[PDB]
């Protein structure tokens, strides 16, 4: 049914999309696991995690995103991560080198989120409690933009690297184009994109959720946690109870999964599984329909 592995250290979980491998934020740094399709019983669609290795940094990873620059050669994995560390640092890992963004130029608050995107160069966007959104361009160029309130989430337009979304804690959702005039549009836990950016989501901690197919700007539909997007299906929407373990799949209200506390969770690169990190365990859950 599900596949389960105990884990020594746990924080955030991301799945590799920018290809069948998984990253566990931890206190020391990040463990890389491999999704293996094989099952020895010859029952298929049973998926295991192999813990390939623990990467060490010595600082806690709160948030992590993979770069497309990652490759696998003949056994050695060449992996690049955009990471958030406990000391309010955004880093780019290659263990050959680590880029640091900190100092005056860096965030002076907690860094809620980070995302990576690929132009003719690579861009890192990050949002903090300092009330700033920062762009890092990979010659090193930086930008610092004021937000109205602390930036809880940031994500780039899929299929459109120039536009991004920022979700401010106050609830303003902003549409940012770095290339053009910075504040293109605004709307009144996270906000994110869906599809080829054909849809915009906005999720509150009181659990109200807005759906915009970006008439007037009014949300097309709305229902009732933090939203986690089904990668292939626009209409399939995932939510969880962090503090139990109630996991809900919304498109009526199904509660598909009930595990302990849930740290963080993400969808498999092609949608079939959900990866869930609890306190002591990491888990693959297969969902169909």
């Amino acid at each position: 049914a599900t596949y389960t592995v105990d884990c020594e250290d746990y924080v955030h979980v991301v799945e590799f999309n920018p290809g069948s491998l998984l990253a566990y934020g931890g206190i020391s740094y990040v463990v890389i696991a491999s999704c293996r399709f094989q099952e020895e019983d010859s029952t298929v669609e049973g998926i295991e995690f192999k813990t390939l290795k623990t990467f060490h940094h010595g600082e806690r990873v709160v948030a992590i995103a993979w770069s497309p620059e990652t490759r696998c050669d003949a056994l050695l994995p060449l992996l690049r991560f955009a990471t958030a560390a406990g000391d309010k640092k955004i880093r780019i890992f290659t263990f050959q080198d680590k880029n640091e963004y900190k100092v005056i130029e860096g965030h002076s608050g907690y860094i809620n989120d980070l995302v990576f995107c690929s132009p003719e160069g690579t861009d890192i966007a990050s949002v903090g409690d300092d009330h700033t959104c920062r762009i890092w361009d990979l010659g090193k160029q930086i930008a610092m933009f004021i937000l109205r309130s602390p930036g809880m989430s940031v994500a780039w337009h899929p299929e459109g690297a120039f536009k991004l979304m920022v979700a401010e804690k106050t609830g303003t959702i902003r549409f940012y184009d770095l290339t053009t005039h910075q504040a293109i549009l605004s709307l009144e836990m996270s906000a994110d994109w869906c599809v080829r950016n054909t849809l915009r989501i906005g999720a509150v901690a009181g659990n109200d959720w807005i759906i915009w197919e970006m008439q007037d700007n009014k949300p097309a539909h709305a229902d009732r946690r933090m939203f986690r997007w089904s990668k292939c299906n626009e209409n399939v929407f995932a939510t969880t109870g962090y503090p139990k373990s109630q996991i809900a799949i919304h498109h009526p209200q199904p509660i598909l999964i009930g595990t302990p506390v849930g740290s963080g969770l993400s969808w498999h690169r092609r949608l079939p599984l959900c990866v869930v990190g609890g306190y002591r365990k990491l888990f693959f859950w297969l969902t169909e329909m």
Partner: protein, 504 residues
């Protein structure tokens, strides 16, 4: 005048906006809303045993349930309009006056209406300037100087220029300006004009530029008016900061009326300055300053951004406050809104002797003048939002503290380590332990002797024992107290690395 429209999305979607506009009008009682709910349903006395928030939810849910993208928005707006009209119609039965009584203990005349109570106040200068017409403003006979420029005719010309430019903005346009103005706290005037003003102004810009050029010294004039409008000798001082001592509910409603009128005028001043700054006119650019030593509209604009910030904060504070599910300021626990709580922290009465103002000539009216003051007279004292937000935090008002968290980070001159330490605690109480750490790491409390904040006591108890490694030792303990044991340990290690105290 009340106006209403669709929303693009700045002041949310129409359902939220109509819910606020229905709960907030000063022509509202609970019984009329409950009677209106009966018309879109059934029911009667059972709506009395509902909480105020549950009552908001039942109204909102009732309207949504009836309605089955553009037609859905139009039909939803119309249902809310019908409901608003029905609530108002039942209410206007209450607006009938019944009697008028004077009370000699208070300095109060009390009007009795058929389900509303009223008292008479004299209008403020702000209320007089908000209302029309321009001629009536100029009909005020000159007592501090003669019939002349310093009276001021030239000033009164400028405040009506402000009001006309503001009258251009729609409610949709006004909402986008609000999203911008608190976020604004770059070379703001040029961009803020381009997006907000330039699109929504006709070529009345030439008429505005000509009239501003004709007036002699217009910067001195409208700066003196701002001083008269933020005007809340020894006699003046005595009549100013009145003596530190239902009352809250009453002045909450006054502070809302006064905040709304000021909020327009402070915006209108910003709009005219934004308009002036992006003009290619040498004469008007020269009229926007004292040349050398240089004092432009840039120093004046900063004070307007600060006044807008404090007023927009107080306007937000109208809506909310959560209860639990006589000497010690007993109102503090029992208040129903944050503006009422802010009121009571500022409590005044003219009759008691003031220890710090012994020559003062010896509560409702007194308290209004003092609440209006604390926003307007800034010097050495701490940021107003920060003091009020600390008082909220001390009374366990975490949701309310969380709502106003963004305002604790504003213009750079008003941003202090004590504010950031408050952001960190708010995030701990609201379970946002990651964001709490980011604030604790960036900001240091090396403010060992600040008597003003009850929040600093826990730092200070160790600062009396020990020196600056105590900040990390304090945050270490605070995160132990909330059960976050990775983050605790790192700070214990930071506290040793920053280092009888060693033994302790």
């Amino acid at each position: 005048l009340p106006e209403d429209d669709l929303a693009i999305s700045d002041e949310q979607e129409p359902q939220e906006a109509y819910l606020e506009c229905l709960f907030a009008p000063g022509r509202f009682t609970i019984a009329a809303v409950q009677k209106a709910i009966q018309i879109l349903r059934k029911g009667s006395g059972r709506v009395l045993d509902l909480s105020w928030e549950e009552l908001r939810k039942d109204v909102t849910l009732t309207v949504e349930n009836e309605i089955q993208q553009e037609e859905f928005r139009q039909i939803n707006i119309e249902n809310w309009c019908k409901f608003y009209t029905c609530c108002l119609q039942y209410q206007e039965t209450l607006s009938r006056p019944l009697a008028l009584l004077v009370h000699p203990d208070t300095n109060m005349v009390c009007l009795l209406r058929k389900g509303f109570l009223s008292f008479l106040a004299p209008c403020s200068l702000v209320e007089h300037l908000y209302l029309v017409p321009a001629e009536h403003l100029l009909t005020v006979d000159e007592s501090v100087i003669s019939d002349d420029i310093d009276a001021a005719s030239d000033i009164v010309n400028l405040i009506q220029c402000l009001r006309m430019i503001a009258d251009y903005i729609s409610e949709d346009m006004a909402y986008l300006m609000e999203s911008a103005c608190c976020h604004l706290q770059e070379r703001v005037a040029e961009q803020i004009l381009e997006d907000l003003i330039a699109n929504d102004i006709d070529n009345i810009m030439e008429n505005i530029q000509n009239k501003l050029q004709d007036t002699r010294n217009p910067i001195r004039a409208i700066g003196f008016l701002l001083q008269n409008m933020d005007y809340e000798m020894e006699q003046p001082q005595p009549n100013t900061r009145l003596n530190l001592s239902t009352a809250s509910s009453v002045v909450c409603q006054a502070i809302c009326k006064i905040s709304a009128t000021r909020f327009l005028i402070c915006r209108d001043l910003l709009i005219l300055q934004h308009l002036l700054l992006r003009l290619g006119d040498m004469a008007l650019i020269g009229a926007g300053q004292l040349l050398h030593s240089q004092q432009e509209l840039i120093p004046r604009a900063a004070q307007l951004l600060l006044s807008y910030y404090m007023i927009r904060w107080g306007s937000q504070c109208l809506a909310c406050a959560v209860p639990v599910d006589v000497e010690k300021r007993r109102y503090t626990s029992g208040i129903q809104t944050i503006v009422e709580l802010f009121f009571e922290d500022v409590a005044r009465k003219h009759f008691p002797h003031v220890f710090i103002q012994s020559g003062a000539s010896q509560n409702w009216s007194d308290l209004i003048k003092r609440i209006t003051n604390y926003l307007l007279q800034l010097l050495w004292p701490s940021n107003p939002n920060f003091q009020f937000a600390e008082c909220l935090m001390r009374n366990c008002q975490y949701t309310q503290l969380q709502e106003y968290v963004r305002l604790l980070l504003p213009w750079c001159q008003v941003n202090v380590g004590s504010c950031h330490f408050m952001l960190a605690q708010c995030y701990l109480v609201a379970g946002e332990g990651h964001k709490a750490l980011d604030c604790f790491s960036q900001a240091a409390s090396e403010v060992e002797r600040e008597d003003f904040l009850e929040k600093l006591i826990r730092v200070e108890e160790g600062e009396s024992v020990s020196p600056r490694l105590q900040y990390y030792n304090r945050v270490l303990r605070l995160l132990e107290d909330v059960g976050l044991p990775e983050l605790v340990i790192q700070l214990a290690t930071i506290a040793i690395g920053e280092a009888r105290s060693q033994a302790a």
